[PDB]
Amino acid sequence: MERYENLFAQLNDRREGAFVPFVTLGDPGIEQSLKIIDTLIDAGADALELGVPFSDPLADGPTIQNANLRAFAAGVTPAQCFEMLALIREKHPTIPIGLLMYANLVFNNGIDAFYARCEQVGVDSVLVADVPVEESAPFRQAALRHNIAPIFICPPNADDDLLRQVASYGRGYTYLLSRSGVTGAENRGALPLHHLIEKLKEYHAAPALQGFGISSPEQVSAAVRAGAAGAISGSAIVKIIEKNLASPKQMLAELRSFVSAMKAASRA
Amino acid sequence: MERYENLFAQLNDRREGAFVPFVTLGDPGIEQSLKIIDTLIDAGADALELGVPFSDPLADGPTIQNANLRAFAAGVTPAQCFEMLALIREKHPTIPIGLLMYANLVFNNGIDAFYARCEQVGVDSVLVADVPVEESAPFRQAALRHNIAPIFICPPNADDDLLRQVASYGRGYTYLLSRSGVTGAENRGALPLHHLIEKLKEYHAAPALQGFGISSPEQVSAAVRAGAAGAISGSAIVKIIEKNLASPKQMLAELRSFVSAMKAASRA
Amino acid sequence: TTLLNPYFGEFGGMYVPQILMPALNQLEEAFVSAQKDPEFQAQFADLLKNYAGRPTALTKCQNITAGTRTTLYLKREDLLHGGAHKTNQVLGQALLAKRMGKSEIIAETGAGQHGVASALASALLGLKCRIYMGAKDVERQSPNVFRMRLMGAEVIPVHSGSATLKDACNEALRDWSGSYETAHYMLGTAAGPHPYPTIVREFQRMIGEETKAQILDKEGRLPDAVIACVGGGSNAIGMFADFINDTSVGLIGVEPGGHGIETGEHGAPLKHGRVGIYFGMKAPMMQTADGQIEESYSISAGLDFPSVGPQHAYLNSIGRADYVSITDDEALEAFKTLCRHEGIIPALESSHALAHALKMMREQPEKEQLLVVNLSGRGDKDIFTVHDILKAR
Amino acid sequence: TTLLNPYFGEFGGMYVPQILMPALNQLEEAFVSAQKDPEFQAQFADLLKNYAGRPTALTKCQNITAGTRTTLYLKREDLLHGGAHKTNQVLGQALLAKRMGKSEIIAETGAGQHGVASALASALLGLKCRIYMGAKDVERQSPNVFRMRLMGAEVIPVHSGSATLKDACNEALRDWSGSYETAHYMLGTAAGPHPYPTIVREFQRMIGEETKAQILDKEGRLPDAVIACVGGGSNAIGMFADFINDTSVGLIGVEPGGHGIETGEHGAPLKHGRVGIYFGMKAPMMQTADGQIEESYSISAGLDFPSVGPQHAYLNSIGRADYVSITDDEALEAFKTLCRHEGIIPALESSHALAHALKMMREQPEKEQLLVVNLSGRGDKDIFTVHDILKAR
């Protein structure tokens, strides 16, 4: 499969950007998380970024730290996450599905075996948050052997060597960090910026998705206007879950309203 | 005056030893202490050794430590002790009265002035427990200027130089320590012994009184048989006070019975 | 691309988010530069001598070994300013921070000794210090938290995850990933991403250098073995480094056995954990079957860490160093024995090293052996822990 | 008859019961012999170096004095094994005990530091140690009482008199007066009957000897003044001794002012007491109008003693040393200032010396002066005392 390539071609045909929510799998429990994810898709999500709960999410701010904790309170394991993934794919055959992983969960029972399991359930990409390009070889090689896109990160201050490496090594999409620091809606980033977006295109990188701090429709619109192929939003989505824990039907209605507005901002 | 010289001459005429109790002035209060002292005399005490309550009686074991504490609980001061002394002398004109002092109470307001006050109230001797012969000069000189006997201590292991010094410097009586350590009836001493008693007589020392640990009539008898002129008992007397605090008339009866038995043991 | 090898065989590396790579590269370059700079070396030596009190003594313990063929010396890091060896490397890292032009320090701490060391170095050298500490540790380490605050450091409780050391480690890295332009992360052991395992070794290696000179002076020969407790690995690698090339000298690292290896309540990942990737490194760690980072356990808070520095994993793999474990009860008995026979109150951490030396002696009392135990810290902080157990006995 | 002068002008002497004179004469003879014995000197130097960690550092404190013409060094007795200078002289007295063939040690303690020092020396050197401590002090010094017991010492509460230090002093002498044939009384300060003020000075004088060599090395000249707190006088006389004949060097002793001299709640008998005779000596003391020995007072338990060593009274009388006082609040501010600006936690006792140096600097900030403060101990023991007051603020 190449679900991202098909998505980006379709969006390009429509002069449209991608809107890609992040959530933690199994937050606040397996059944509600499956409903959340179906809601995000029905509301207009072009692709998904999905976190496997991890004990030590060191690239995440408090909102997503708390999502991981809620999933653990519900007993969510990586094996349950793969069951969820298989079901999500069985429901939705074309949406690109990306995982947000930390290295130990990939390395734990063997790197090759991890990416083989991703291929089996129909995942499209894996972003390992704590593996920089410098350490990425065995991860990217295993990803490509199993038809999984390895996602790499372009920081705002990326030099030319790093841009070249991210462009060569990544597939699916290039992650364009909006700022330094950790995930969170409370901290708005840049200013993609344009120079980086242009150099990535020059180097034939996978299309750029901007992420970190994207919490409003205006930011989605700006990202696309700057030349990114779309935008990722996590904390802003997860905050709606957190706010409405006691009210699961209201949670779904608010997610739908938010995602619909965010996706609307990506259209030409 | 020389009350000790007269006493010892009278006792010698009768082939008799001296029995000399110690108590703390003002234990357990001024009025009861005056009654205690009158009782000791009526029961046969030949002389008295009387302590002025001091904060830090470092030659005294627990029995006499507790006597000092009781006197302080009653508010007893050195000035009140001198009032007591003057009254005791006004009642009893011939009994020798010795004070047991610690140096700071003598030095406090001037050494000469202390011994002048002793002369004024009719005290016969002063034993300063924490002034060894080596430090004694200003104390013995002030004592002699005011017709007070300075008492010195002969330890059991006294060498010849020390015997010579105690014999030369002391007056009234020579204190013959029965043992090392501190006052207390719980620890019986020696074994005066005879060699020391004989050397003291050779050096024309004041007559010897044995003290520390003397708690029974048999010890009084033995001291005199060994050649001492008599014996001092403190803790054994003070224990009777301690035991009968709640029963002041019983206290006096028990003191009388004890002192009578102790004095009986000194007779030929 | 790096200047130095980030790995010790398969172990180590730089497993941090991409955003932190320039901070690690900058730190490595400044370290390499500082190591060739005689002025930096002279400044560091001057602080170690005149502020921290180096060289520390090497004490022969004759009462402990009476009637055996063991000769035992203790390297007295308990006498260093602050009461533990941690002071050496925080002084060097504070000088690196200043070399790079940074004015702020971030540090993690569990038991609080590293937080106190970081705070004292920062007070001396004019740096603004903030310390992350799991909220459970904050609660149980009031004396150390108060020391940090007296020295002007900000202590920030961490409530995420298990609210203990690993969560404080994460939070320090989260802060650094946004603040590296102005702050240096003063990591507290010989672990984490390159270049930290290397830097911390080099800023602790005077322990072993001095020990070598002192034992040569006193005995005319090298030790048969040097023995050190292993939390993250700093005091042990500081003792071991200068001996690595002296092939006759045994290197023995002692992990906490807690209630016993078989109970699972221990802190001995090097010999009883599983290799993983966390806190910036590939190393043995305490982890669940699924790969969640697990909590360790020791009576000594300072040894209670769920991984180990990568150089120890490497030295073990090639057989150059041997690693063993000592239980809580063994460490407690060594603590009591040193107090009573030598008049030295050892840290409970260090008591693990001593307990293994005592076992070496007692098991084979006619074996001729010259041993050095690294006495990493003093045990004033532990008297109530020891009291509360001996009270329950 | 004695070998050495028991007096310092009018002060000092041997005011003990006659039964104790032979014990003092024996001790004096053994001391005089030991001072001429190169083997005793070598053994003492070896313990000081390899067990206690001498020489202690001399630390220049630049942050504290910024913007003034004061140069301040701290003599780091806080780095000595045990965390205070007391360790020096207990090691020497334990060696004297063994020289005399004694196998038992008696010691008094108030705050507990001397008890701990005595217990550690006794554990090292194979002596059976018993420690008298006022019952009120036992209650308030649990950490130190536990240290003493861990090191194998018997701690005997004293309930007589005020159940504090002076009562423990009395009880130690009561015991000795019956046990001197087998026990040595390890007196804890430069006070009491001759020969103790002399012995304790000579076994502390390495403080000043080292300071002199260190300051000559660093500054090329002697200090303008050396400053030390005064409880009984040991750390101060140890700092002062080697400078007494350097007439340009000021000697400044700092007594505790407590709540203020005018309140009567203080521990400053040298300047505000009255000469008396107690604890074997003629010296200034805290006493009532009638001559009862009074209780002193300081925030620092270690300075809370109602007399002073006779050599200090003498040096004051001839003008060779000047004595001042520092209140609880002044000492607390110095404690906080050293923590925050130098990363050193000082004993509250030592904080009195530091507070007076800070006043010397602040009052006359353009006066050129080279000062050494004797940092007699570390302040870990004080963090909760300081906490509990800063909490109430």
Ligand SMILES: O=P(O)(O)OCCNS(=O)(=O)c1ccc(OC(F)(F)F)cc1
């Ligand atoms: O909207 P926000 O600020 O919560 O950001 C959500 C991002 N979620 S994610 O899965 O894309 C994502 C991507 C990269 C991350 O770290 C790394 F850059 F180090 F790799 C972490 C999370």
Ligand SMILES: O=P(O)(O)OCCNS(=O)(=O)c1ccc(OC(F)(F)F)cc1
């Ligand atoms: O019967 P005991 O054992 O209580 O002894 C009572 C002694 N009372 S005393 O006043 O003679 C007396 C005599 C000398 C003392 O000390 C000194 F020897 F050091 F001077 C103390 C008390």
Ligand SMILES: *Cc1c(COP(=O)(O)O)cnc(C)c1O
């Ligand atoms: C922190 C500490 C240790 C353990 O940490 P390492 O990095 O393994 O040295 C050991 N001993 C003491 C006294 C400590 O403070």
Ligand SMILES: *Cc1c(COP(=O)(O)O)cnc(C)c1O
């Ligand atoms: C005991 C003590 C003192 C006071 O005693 P001195 O005999 O006057 O030195 C001062 N500082 C510290 C740290 C102490 O432990």
Ligand SMILES: [Cl-]
């Ligand atoms: Cl909204």
Ligand SMILES: [Cl-]
């Ligand atoms: Cl009877």
Ligand SMILES: [Cl-]
């Ligand atoms: Cl490798």
Ligand SMILES: [Cl-]
């Ligand atoms: Cl044995």
Ligand SMILES: [Cl-]
């Ligand atoms: Cl400290």
Ligand SMILES: [Cl-]
């Ligand atoms: Cl061997």
Ligand SMILES: [Cl-]
């Ligand atoms: Cl070997």
Ligand SMILES: [Cl-]
């Ligand atoms: Cl391994």
Ligand SMILES: [Cl-]
């Ligand atoms: Cl004189």
Ligand SMILES: [Cl-]
């Ligand atoms: Cl200033």
Ligand SMILES: [Cl-]
């Ligand atoms: Cl100690």
Ligand SMILES: [Cl-]
């Ligand atoms: Cl000057």
